[PDB]
Amino acid sequence: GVIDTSAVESAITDGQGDMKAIGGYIVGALVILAVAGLIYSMLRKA
Amino acid sequence: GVIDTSAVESAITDGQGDMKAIGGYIVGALVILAVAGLIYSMLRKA
Amino acid sequence: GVIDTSAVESAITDGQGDMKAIGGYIVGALVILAVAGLIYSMLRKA
Amino acid sequence: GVIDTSAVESAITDGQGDMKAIGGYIVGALVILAVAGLIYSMLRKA
Amino acid sequence: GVIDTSAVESAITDGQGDMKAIGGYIVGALVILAVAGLIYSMLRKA
Amino acid sequence: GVIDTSAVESAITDGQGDMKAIGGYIVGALVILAVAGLIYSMLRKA
Amino acid sequence: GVIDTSAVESAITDGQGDMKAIGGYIVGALVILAVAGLIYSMLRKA
Amino acid sequence: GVIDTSAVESAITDGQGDMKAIGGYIVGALVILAVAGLIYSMLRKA
Amino acid sequence: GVIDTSAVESAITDGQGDMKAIGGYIVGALVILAVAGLIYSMLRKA
Amino acid sequence: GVIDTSAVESAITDGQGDMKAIGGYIVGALVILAVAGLIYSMLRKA
Amino acid sequence: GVIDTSAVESAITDGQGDMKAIGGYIVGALVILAVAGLIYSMLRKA
Amino acid sequence: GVIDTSAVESAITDGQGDMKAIGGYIVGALVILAVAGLIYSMLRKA
Amino acid sequence: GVIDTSAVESAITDGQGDMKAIGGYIVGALVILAVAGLIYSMLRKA
Amino acid sequence: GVIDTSAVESAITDGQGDMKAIGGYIVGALVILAVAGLIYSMLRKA
Amino acid sequence: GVIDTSAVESAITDGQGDMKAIGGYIVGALVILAVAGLIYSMLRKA
Amino acid sequence: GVIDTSAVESAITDGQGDMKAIGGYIVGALVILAVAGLIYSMLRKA
Amino acid sequence: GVIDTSAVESAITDGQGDMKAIGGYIVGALVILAVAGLIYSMLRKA
Amino acid sequence: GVIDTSAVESAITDGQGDMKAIGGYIVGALVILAVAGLIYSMLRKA
Amino acid sequence: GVIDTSAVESAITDGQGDMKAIGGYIVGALVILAVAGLIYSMLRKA
Amino acid sequence: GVIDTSAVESAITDGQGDMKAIGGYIVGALVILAVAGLIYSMLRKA
Amino acid sequence: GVIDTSAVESAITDGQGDMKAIGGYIVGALVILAVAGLIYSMLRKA
Amino acid sequence: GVIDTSAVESAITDGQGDMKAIGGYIVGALVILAVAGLIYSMLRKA
Amino acid sequence: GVIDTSAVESAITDGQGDMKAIGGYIVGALVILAVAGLIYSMLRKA
Amino acid sequence: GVIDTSAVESAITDGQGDMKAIGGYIVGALVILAVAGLIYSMLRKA
Amino acid sequence: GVIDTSAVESAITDGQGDMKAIGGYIVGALVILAVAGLIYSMLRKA
Amino acid sequence: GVIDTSAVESAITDGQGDMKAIGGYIVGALVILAVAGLIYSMLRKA
Amino acid sequence: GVIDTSAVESAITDGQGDMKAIGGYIVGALVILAVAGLIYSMLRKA
Amino acid sequence: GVIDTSAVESAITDGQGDMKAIGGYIVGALVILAVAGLIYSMLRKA
Amino acid sequence: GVIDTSAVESAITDGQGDMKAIGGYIVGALVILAVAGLIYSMLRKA
Amino acid sequence: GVIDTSAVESAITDGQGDMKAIGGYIVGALVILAVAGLIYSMLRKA
Amino acid sequence: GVIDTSAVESAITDGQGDMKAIGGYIVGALVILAVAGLIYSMLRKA
Amino acid sequence: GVIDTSAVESAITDGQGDMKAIGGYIVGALVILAVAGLIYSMLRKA
Amino acid sequence: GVIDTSAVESAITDGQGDMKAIGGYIVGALVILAVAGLIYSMLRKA
Amino acid sequence: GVIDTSAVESAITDGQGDMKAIGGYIVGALVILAVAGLIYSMLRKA
Amino acid sequence: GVIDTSAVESAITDGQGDMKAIGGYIVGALVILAVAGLIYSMLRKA
């Protein structure tokens, strides 16, 4: 006896991709703050 | 004299398979909660 | 004098076999309750 | 004088055999009740 | 002299068959109680 | 005068043996009910 | 002599089928609780 | 000689039908307990 | 000399038929007790 | 010669009806126990 | 012969209604626990 | 001939009323357990 | 010649009525045991 | 001729009263078991 | 005939009061758990 | 004629007192389980 | 002519009293079994 | 005439004492089951 | 026949009120946690 | 012989619908907690 | 057969309103934190 | 019947006071953080 | 008849005191977490 | 007559002590969970 | 023998879809918090 | 006359010792469940 | 004239002793069943 | 004149011994039934 | 005169040993149920 | 005399083996519930 | 007389070892949850 | 006697592997949150 | 009578040690989270 | 009756000391962050 | 008795290593933020 978490092991990875996937998009929006913030300073400083 | 639980011994195993079998499917649904929950956190955190 | 329960002694055994025999079948049905009951719990627990 | 119950003494035994003989057969039928009764209980109990 | 219980010996067996015969039918009805009772439990337990 | 129940005294014992003898066999069948009944409970309980 | 529980042996199986049969349906209802319960958690967790 | 339990054999079956018949109705009431009990749990669990 | 119990021998059988005959009817009534008693248990057990 | 148990044969049936008749009423009372008992459980279980 | 459980068959249903009837009321009380419990969480969560 | 269980038939019903009558009161006490038990849970849950 | 058991034939019936008569009353008392016994069980079971 | 069971008929009823009478008292003691048992459960359940 | 469960009917109520009575006290102790538990949370949360 | 169950009527009550008496003590022990169980929960919950 | 069973008629009653008398005492002992048996159950049940 | 069951009346009571006497001891053993059973639950519950 | 759960139906509602009633008070205490918690945050945040 | 759980099989489904039915409504209330909770965070976060 | 959760279905909605209702008030208090927090920053920033 | 949660209703309030009471003290300590934090900033800013 | 839960009523209160008693001590330990946690923040914030 | 449960009354108390006794020890182990759990939180929180 | 959880296996998947389905919608609402929060920062930072 | 249950009285006690004796050992095994169960919780909680 | 049953009166008592004597021994064996039966229950219950 | 039943008086006693003698042996066989019967019960009960 | 149940007295004891003897073995099998049952719970609980 | 339960003693053991034997298999199925349950928690917790 | 539960006493211990034995293994699996859970937190926290 | 949990001991380990196995995968997904979160901060901070 | 939980009292303590023992090790692992978390902050803050 | 949580009351304090004790050490590490952070600012500011 | 958490004690440490191990790697990534952040300032400041 045991418990066949055969497909359910690899199933974990199914969601994982999603975990790596969502980040890119948020992090892509995050990037504006790094631009705009330096722009925000740019126009005072430069 | 005795009592011939000959086939009834191995009969126990007949159901057992079922016992190991059902788990995989529930545990396969359980896995969503581990994905979605980390997704639920992902979108706040990441 | 005495009373010749010669064959009637061994006759007892004739029925006996029947006594051991019926049990297996009932006990074979009993076994469902041990499966189904754990299945009944399986689907809540697992 | 006396009364010659010479053969009539041993004659008693002639019938006797019959007395021991009939019993076996009835007692052989009696035995069903000991089987069936335990069978009658068997199917409720076992 | 004696007493010719010649046919009356084997006569005992005539009824006997009847003795074995009736049992099967009652015991066949008995069997419902073993089914229904486990069914009675089945629907609570399973 | 008296009545010579000399052999007929010990004759009583002839049948007696039979009385002790039959019991063992029935009691040997009785024993199934003690097994099967605990088996009947075993499969629900254990 | 004996006791002809010939058909009554196989008769046991007649009810048995019923014993295996009822379970599926209850266990099919049981399954909602495994869905709904994870749904009940899903909507808080996910 | 014998004893004509000719019709009385099949007579056993007359009652039997009744034996199978009553069960359905009780078992039909039993079924509420399997519904209501899961409903009883449903409203806490789901 | 002798005593002509010629017809009176076979006469015994005349009554006998009656002896086998009455039984069927009583035994046919007896059968209710085997039905009703199991019905009496049926409605508690099943 | 014989013995005219002509009407007394069918007489057996006169009482029989009574034998089938009384049962219905008791068995009709028995039925409460099957209701009330499940009601007794109903109010704890449901 | 047989046993007239004619009305006693349908009698089973008489109690049944009661079996379906009581449930609604308990289950109607059960429902508070599903409200109050979510209210109990509502006031912490929302 | 027969046996006049004329009034004794309907007599069965005399007791019956009692059979239906007692239940209400016990079942009325049973109901506390369904209240108190949900109250017992109420004060933890709600 | 013969023997005039003319009135003595029908006389048998005179007592008979008594035979059918007494039964009703005893059987009417018997009925309490069928009520009280089910009442005896009622108060534990229901 | 006949047999004057005139007073002895109604005599049956003399005892009967006693038959109905004793029951009340036992059944009155029975009732404790229905209270105490629910009390026995009350203190665990409520 | 019948069975005088006259006082034994109302007797049921005698115990009942007890059934309603015990609950208040347990439920009064239950209430601490609803206070202390919220106190247990109070000191972390507030 | 009758049967003088004069003192034996009231005798029933003699035992009854005992029936009410024993309960208090058991029910007094039962009460620990209601304390300790809530204590058992108290120390986790509070 | 006749036969003067004048005093012997009423003599019957002399013994009768005894017949009613002995019962009370046995029935008074019987009553323990109704107490003790319910006590025997009391200590398990209550 | 009559029958002098003078001492034999009171003799009934001689045995009676024994009837009340044995009970105490069994009932004293019964009491363990009420302790141990609550102990059996105590160690799981408390 | 049936079982008169006439008042016992509406009896369910008697307890129900209690079920709705207790909640308000607990939920009224719950509300502090929603105030104090926001107060707990208020004094850091505002 | 067997046991006609013909309608009682499909009867299981009768309750089932109820099992799927109740969930929707609770789960529909559950959904508030997913809104309000994100609203609860919304007003701090956004 | 089935289980009449007719009103108990719509009953779910009764509580629901409450579920939507409480939120508004808490969320109305939540809003202070969004004002005060920006006020808390306002007085440093502006 | 019902369940007298008469004092146990108002009992809820007993704990409540405690619920309002503890908060003041914690919230009184919370206040330091609002002082010290602005002091922590004061000494850099002012 | 009734059941003398006279002392067993007030007995409930015996344990209760214990129920109120244990809380103070745990809640007294709980208080550290409210100090230390604000201390934990104090040293970062102040 | 009666039944001398004289010592068996006080016997109940013999076990009782045991009932109060075992609890202390379990409850003494329970206490670790209240320490360790707050320690488990202590090291994250403080 | 075994237990035909044939359709009930695949039945698990029926609910599963629902499990994957609900998430998308919540996670779609979650996304606002990732926008608004960065907007909340955007207007201070940019 | 009487019945010398002289030694048979004290004989009751012979078995009793056994009754007290077996319990200790089972109750000693019971104790593991109280340890292991708290250990089972210990490793999650602590 | 009369009949000198002088010694034969007291002779009755000679056998009597035997009547009281045999009982003790059987009743001494009976006692095992009261031990073993409670032992039989002991090992399941305790 | 008279009739010299001198030796014939004491002769009566010659047979008597035989009368006391035979009993022991039968009664010795009787005893098996008291053993076996309790054994017959032993194996079901114990 | 009397009846020499001299050896037949002690004969009672011959069977007795058997009565004490059989119990040990059954009770030895009983013990599995006390192990397995706690094992049955062990694997869920521990 | 005695009763030769010579083989029937050791016969008890024949069934016993069966008693120890069946357990292993059920307990082997039980084990899934200990795995799956921790798996059921694993996927939420880990 | 008594009942030789000599080996059956120590027999209890045979199973006990098993009771202590199984725990270690489950508790050894339990330990993962204490690792993984802190790992689950580790990767967010550390 | 004992209970052969020979393979069932090592069986525990069968599931265990699964317990260690699932964690790696979840913990592997957990790791994104530790990356993305520091990335989420990276793009503001760096 | 009583129940010798003499060693079983102190037995409780046997497990207890284990209860205090396991905690240290978990709490020793807990401590990393208090280090690493402050390290996690250290490297941003310091 | 009551429950002797005599030592278990003061036992609470045993752990408490530990609760006050651990804090000092963590809070002693916390202090670095208050130094280093001001040092971190010191080297830019001063 | 006790519970052999012999290896399971040291087992705790098995995971621990993992607990110390993961930190280094995260903390190694944390370090970038301390570099980059000072670099982020470096290029404005220096």
Curated annotation (Swiss-Prot), chains A, B, C, D, E, F, G, H, I, J, K, L, M, N, O, P, Q, R, S, T, U, V, W, X, Y, Z, AA, AB, AC, AD, AE, AF, AG, AH, AI:
Q: How does it sit in the membrane?
A: Single-pass type I membrane protein
Membrane-side (Cytoplasmic) residue stretches: 43-46
Keywords for the protein's UniProt record, in alphabetical order:
Capsid protein, Helical capsid protein, Host membrane, Membrane, Signal, Transmembrane, Transmembrane helix, Virion
Q: Which residues lie on this side of the membrane: Periplasmic?
A: 1-21
Where can this protein be found? Virion; Host membrane
Which regions span the lipid bilayer? 22-42
GO CC aspect terms: helical viral capsid; host cell membrane; membrane
Q: How does it assemble?
A: Homomultimerizes. There are several thousands of this protein in the phage capsid.
Role according to the record: Self assembles to form a helical capsid wrapping up the viral genomic DNA. The capsid displays a filamentous structure with a length of 760-1950 nm and a width of 6-8 nm. The virion assembly and budding take place at the host inner membrane.
Protein family membership: Belongs to the inovirus capsid protein family.
Q: Know the name of this protein?
A: Capsid protein G8P
